[PDB]
Amino acid sequence: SIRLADLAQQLDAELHGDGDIVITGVASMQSAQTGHITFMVNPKYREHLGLCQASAVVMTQDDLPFAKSAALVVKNPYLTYARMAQILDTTPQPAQNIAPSAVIDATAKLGNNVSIGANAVIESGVELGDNVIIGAGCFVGKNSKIGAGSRLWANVTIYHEIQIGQNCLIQSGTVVGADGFGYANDRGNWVKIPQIGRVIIGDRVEIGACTTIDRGALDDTIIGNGVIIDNQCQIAHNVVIGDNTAVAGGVIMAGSLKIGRYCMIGGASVINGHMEICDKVTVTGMGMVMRPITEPGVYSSGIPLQPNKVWRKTAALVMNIDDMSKRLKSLERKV
Amino acid sequence: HASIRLADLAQQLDAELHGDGDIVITGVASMQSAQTGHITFMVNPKYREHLGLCQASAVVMTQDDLPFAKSAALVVKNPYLTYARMAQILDTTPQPAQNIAPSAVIDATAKLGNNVSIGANAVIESGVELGDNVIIGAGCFVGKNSKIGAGSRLWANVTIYHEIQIGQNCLIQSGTVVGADGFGYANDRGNWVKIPQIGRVIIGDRVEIGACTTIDRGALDDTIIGNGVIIDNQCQIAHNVVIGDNTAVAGGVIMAGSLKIGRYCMIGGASVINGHMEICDKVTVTGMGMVMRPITEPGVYSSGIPLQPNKVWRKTAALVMNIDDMSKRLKSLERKV
Amino acid sequence: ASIRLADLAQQLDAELHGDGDIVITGVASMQSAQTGHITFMVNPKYREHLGLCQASAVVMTQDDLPFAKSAALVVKNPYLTYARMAQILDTTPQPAQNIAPSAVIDATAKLGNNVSIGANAVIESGVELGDNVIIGAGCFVGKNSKIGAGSRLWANVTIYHEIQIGQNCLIQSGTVVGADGFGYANDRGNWVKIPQIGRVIIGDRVEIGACTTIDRGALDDTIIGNGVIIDNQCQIAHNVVIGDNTAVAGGVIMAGSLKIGRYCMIGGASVINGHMEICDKVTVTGMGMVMRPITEPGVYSSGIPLQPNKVWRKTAALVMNIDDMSKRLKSLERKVN
Amino acid sequence: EERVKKIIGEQLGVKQEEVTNNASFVEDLGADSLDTVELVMALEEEFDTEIPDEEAEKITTVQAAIDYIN
Amino acid sequence: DSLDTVELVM
Amino acid sequence: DSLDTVELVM
Secondary structure, three states, X not given: OEEHHHHHHHOOXXXXXXXXXXXXXXXXXXXXXXXXXXXXXXXXXXXXXXXXOOOEXXXXXXOHHHOOOEXXXXXXXXXXXXXXXXXXXXXXXXXXXXXXXXXXXXXXEEOOOOEEOOOOEEOOOOEEOOOOEEOOOOEEOOOOEEOOOOEEOOOOEEOOOOEEOOOXXXXXXXXXXXXXXXXXXXXXXXXXXXXXXXXXXXXXXXXXXXOEEOOOOXXXXXXXXXXXXXXXXXXXXXXXXXXXOEEOOOOEXXXXXXXXXXXXXXXXXXXXXXXXXXXXXXXXXOOEXXXXXXXXXXXXXXXXXXXXXXXXXXXXXXXXXXXXXXXXXXXXXXX | OOOEEHHHHHHHOOOEEEXXXXXXXXXXXXXXXXXXOEEEEOOOHHHHHHOOOOOOOEEEEOHHHXXXXXXXXXXXXXXXXXXXXXXXXXXXXXXXXXXXXXXXXXXXXXXXXXXXXXXXXXXXXXXXXEOOOOEEOOOOEEOOOOEEOOOOEEOOOOEEOOOOEEOOOOEEOXXXXXXXXXXXXXXXXXXXXXXXXXXXXXXXXXXXXXXXXEEOOOOOOOEEEOOOOEEOOOXXXXXXXXXXXXXXXXXXXEEOOOEEEOOOOEEOOOOEEOOOEEEOOOEEEXXXXXXXXXXXXXXXXXXXXXXXXXXXXXXXXXXXXXXXXXXXXXXXXXXXX | OOEEHHHHHHHOOOEEEOOOOOEXXXXXXXXXXXXXXXXXXXXXXXXXHOOOOOOOEEEEOOOOHHHOOOEEEEOOOHHHHHHHHHHHOOOOOOOOOOEOOOOEEOOOOEEOOOOEEOOOOEEOOOOEEOOOOEEOOOOEEOOOOEEOOOOEEOOOOEEOOOOEXXXXXXXXXXXXXXXXXXXXXXXXXXXXXXXXXXXXXXXXXXXXXXXXXXXXXXOOOEEEOOOOEEOOOOXXXXXXXXXXXXXXXXXXXXXXXXXXXXXXXXXXXXXXXXXXXXXXXXXXXXXXXXXXXXXXXEEEEOOOOOEEHHXXXXXXXXXXXXXXXXXXXXXXXXXXX | OHHHHHHHHHHOOOOHHHOOXXXXXXXXXXXXXXXXXXXXXXXXXXXXXXXOHHHHOOOXXXXXXXXXXX | OOXXXXXXXX | OOXXXXXXXX
């Protein structure tokens, strides 16, 4: 809980209204009650301010005339929302102290203020930096290193020789450092290629739930600093992702893909391997990324939904588009 | 449960029995695998000529199939639904756990109902409330202040985060994660700033969720799964998705944030659905559907170009990517004529 | 461990061109290789980089040899040789060693010789673990399941009940084998659960990736053939049958009762319709929309690749109105004739 | 008629002994979601014509197929 | 939306 | 690549 003036000061906001109002949490505009602070980005919501029950609203200078409550005036309300939500965060920690049920190898090195959840399993040679938190039921494999301030939620699996930087967060069900999909073909039989590369995750990487990041074949799979990856993603062996890149849900990357910095990969995109995507590329949802991308910009693929009756026709005409080309050309020859 | 006489089964199934009611039924089986003591069913009349091959003691069928029976027969209106019912009666599926395992780690402030089972090495956090007959599989995690309703069941290695609500008679398969942070971040000049996700997930009653599915918590308000919903494996349900009662989501569907889906919908496998929009009641999207726009009218919706032999596809792809120049050549030709 | 180049050359059936006394400590990429490391090359574009490479040895072919700047191991198939030498010089640890005290092993579970069970693993009644089987930490193995000799599970794998796994299999973490298939009957809009009492039968030498889900059969079994490889994030529905030596790349979604033949290659993120057959030696390229049965071998593809967004918009809008376009082509096709 | 029936037989992957004057494409002849549309396109080519959308919609069985060309 | 203007202009 | 030679012929 916090005083509105004190909150406004931490937010670098211009306070318009009672500084002594007590703020207890953040809430949506529609759910907000007394004690709650909310925010507003889209000017169309200006009319909605007159029915909002929040004690305070974060807005811009232009919105201020329309305000019906105490207002925090800022340049970027969404960003301020993120900051205030961090100050007023009610999210618990994945664990506190070191659980007696945790199985920790004697050669594991623990820094100060490390907490490890019930039934977690820490292998030999592991190094956990200061303030690392390992959630319940996690496995952290041999000789792996997790940097200061990083946190794993329950039931995360980290394989051996993995490096995770500082201030990272990984959600449950995620698996980092499993064997890449490496096999040689011997007369139709698959011969396993041991995957002895690693995964190197930089600082402030946030990874969602049920995501799989495979270890490299010989060199490493590399996730740069400040990268965000959503749920159900597949990051194959020897993928390199540049700093500050965002990967939305259910993306499938193939081996040895290299992605630049500041990219945005939309949900359920499928990306070919052994090629490069340059800096500042946006691929929209369900993108079929078959070819290298050498210039920045927004790229897309796919044909959207149609009524099933219509689609049937559309699909059949497309599968027969070559005949449709020949007939267009002969009709040109004729005239 | 274990065994049942045919006449008693027929009575429970509200079926008309033709044949020996004293026959002992021990389980359900496919037509091709059924042997003595097994009951099977038939829906498609094509199987009529194969009833001689079938070795079941009994077959569930319709009135018109009866003159073809090669065994005792149970006559009903809907053989497929009857099959679901009899398979429930004769189910061999074990429970995820029985009693409270010594190795379970259960916080002192957790409230357990009557006849709760908790499996080995499961972890129950503070403030958790487990309703009567709840079963928590081995190695599960149930986070702070979460509530799981009466008769609900989690298989091994399910992760429930904090402040999650699960109604009654739900079933969740292994590997599933309910209530992880939504994918919320603000962009500060190229750097991603985390938005704490302090909403919850509210799951209704009789909800069945498959394996390795992720349902994220809401940013401020809640992610909501209505009653009687079924969700298959590998699905992604993003923050603040609302799914109406009795909707079916097949495997590998990706839903983006703030999607609202109506009641009685059917979303086909690996469909990808845009967020911040609505899909009205009674919509069907077929497999691999690319759901870019809102859907205001009920009916079946589809997208996608099916497989072609590789050589043929190359041409198709190259021509479609060049369709604006085909559309150009046609306007000019239309002019000439 | 470490190995003399000559002895490594013998084990790999390679022709040693260079000092047999060189000690090889490990395998490395051409770019990262240093003294003591052996590497390999397949693509001839790397022959010009050979001068800069610092490996103590390079695996290559006879036509590569004149470009060698180090000891060389000449073979027919460098990539396969790479696989074999990597196995010889493998540094991967085991998922577990001996039986951990924290493992919860039912009194009736049966262990072969030299079985390792990791910390907090949970083994149900009636389970059978063959010789040299390794069960990683946090694993769950359900009632009466059976795992063949030499098979290994990494941490946090879930095996349901009545599952059979052959010899020398390997399953990466997060994977769930034998969860209920997606079986429901519709009773006036409500989904009625159909218990899934078939099983999963996995052959010998099967490798399965991480967070993959393979559902048990409804009555008969889901079947994975010998030597099958399956990558991460795949969904294999109830009663899928996969033929021997088939490869399934990441994120493939298979619907129920699909039968796939032998020596197939199913590309990443393919979506495959159910209740149909794919014959032997079929290749489906990434993101294949597999709607129809495939009766003839060969390579099949679908999908329209990426375009700059403003280009795609036109491509989409024209493809969508392709019917009105084909019509206009026909009208004009008549006027001229 | 037999002309139509050879086309219906070849597209739908059936033997001519199955092409009954009664037969419906979906119910009797295992037509999928693209089958009839592709079959209607097939009849467009060997009959040197063009079938209107108000009419092809009414072509779901071989009688409806034959009875339209006639 | 992304497609709405193109469709109209068509 | 897979689409290069087709496109070239065009």
